[PDB]
């Protein structure tokens, strides 16, 4: 039969990200000479909504060390940072909400955000609204630092990898019921074309592994193997358990 | 001729009415009219001394 929906997604025709209104990509400062020997100061000049994103952006501007001009950056605003605030960035920066520092220079327990996966990658970890990473240890020989990501995962990255002190703004966005179809409508209208969702169990066999039959039903385990092939992977991929989760979760 | 007789109150009974009382003349229009009149009577009384600013100020919020 036909190419199913989740395969058509990849050719990104009607499926590319709706991008027109976006502020620009959020990114730490390029890791230059200032930030890795000293600190450099900026002013947050505006904190601002970014369509499709949930957390507001901070627009923060710095002087240029090598040329007379301003260079502006787009940060993701940590909660509590504000317009006119001075933002300090560098190895020898001080430990306050809003500043950006290398995880090597912060005590364990430090609560950071937008952290780099490798030094210089201008930020990758915990950027969504409300999210953060905790520093839970250091290993000064072979300078690594060990952190706990929002997913629960613990991971060890370079101590020069940078992050910004505090948590990302907009927390609890998801506490509030969407209430109606229409609010989801406008939600995804500014993201990508993933809404609404026909159940494969409502299609015909041409369309889906789940399609067809004189009652609606999956007709075979919907836990599909990792090694399955395109066209096959619909449902609980690689599922190592299944069913209502009883009892406390949380990584021991 | 007809307009005249309306100026004279004719042709305005219940049998001649098809919009709601409110569609005919809004409650809110009535209110604003009224409230502007109280409001600017206070202003002139104050500005004459006929009333004292203290009494005015209570009258305002009462109005």
């Amino acid at each position: 039969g036909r190419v199913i929906r989740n395969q058509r997604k990849g050719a990104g025709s009607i499926f590319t990200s709706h991008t027109r209104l976006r502020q620009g990509a959020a990114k730490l400062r390029t890791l230059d000479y200032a930030e890795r020997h000293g600190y450099i100061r900026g002013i947050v000049k505006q904190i601002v909504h970014d369509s499709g994103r949930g957390a507001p952006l901070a627009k923060v501007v710095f002087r240029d060390p090598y040329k007379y001009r301003l260079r502006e950056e787009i940060f993701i605003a940590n909660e509590g940072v504000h317009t006119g605030q001075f933002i300090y960035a560098g190895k020898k920066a001080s430990l306050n909400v809003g500043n950006v520092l290398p995880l090597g220079s912060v005590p364990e327990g430090t609560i950071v955000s937008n952290v780099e996966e490798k030094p210089g990658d201008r930020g990758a970890l915990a950027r969504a609204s409300g999210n953060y990473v905790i520093i839970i240890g250091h290993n000064p020989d072979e300078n690594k630092t060990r952190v706990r990501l929002p997913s629960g995962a613990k991971k060890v990255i370079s101590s020069d990898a940078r992050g910004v002190i505090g948590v990302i703004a907009g927390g609890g966005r998801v506490d509030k019921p969407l209430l109606k179809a229409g609010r989801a409508f406008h939600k995804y209208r500014l993201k990508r074309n993933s809404w609404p969702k026909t159940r494969g169990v409502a299609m015909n066999p041409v369309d889906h592994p789940h399609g067809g039959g004189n009652h609606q039903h999956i007709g075979k385990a919907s836990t599909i193997s990792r090694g399955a092939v395109s066209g096959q992977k619909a449902g609980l991929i690689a599922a190592r358990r299944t069913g209502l989760l009883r009892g406390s979760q949380k990584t021991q | 001729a007809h307009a005249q007789s309306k100026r004279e109150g004719r042709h305005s009974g219940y049998g001649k009415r098809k919009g709601t009382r409110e569609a005919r003349l809004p409650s809110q229009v009535v209110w604003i009219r009224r409230l502007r009149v109280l409001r600017r009577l206070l202003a002139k009384y104050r500005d004459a001394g006929k009333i004292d600013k203290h009494l005015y100020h209570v009258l305002y919020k009462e109005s």
Binding site: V97, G172, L179 | -
Partner: protein, 91 residues
């Protein structure tokens, strides 16, 4: 004259969606539309303007905050944590 025994702002949804959802919405609505205190100048004039953004009418500071409330519990504890942790570093 009390207009509603309990739906409050949530009366705009009529009978739809189910009382429970309307409850949850009620709580965060009241939060987000509320007027808050401004730390910098002291007048209670901080109103929201899109999730996470909190600006002051007078004086004009804008502070990144919670999706529906100026300060988030998590934010707040984190703040004092940082207070605490930094304290060690000069001491």
């Amino acid at each position: 004259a009390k207009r509603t025994k309990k739906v409050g702002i949530t009366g705009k949804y009529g009978v739809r969606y189910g009382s429970s959802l309307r409850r949850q919405v009620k709580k965060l609505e009241i939060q987000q539309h509320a007027r808050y205190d401004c730390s910098f100048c002291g007048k209670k004039t901080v109103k929201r303007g899109a999730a996470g953004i909190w600006t002051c009418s007078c004086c004009k500071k804008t502070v990144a905050g919670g999706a529906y409330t100026v300060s988030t519990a998590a934010a707040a504890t984190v703040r004092s944590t940082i207070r605490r942790l930094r304290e060690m570093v000069e001491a």
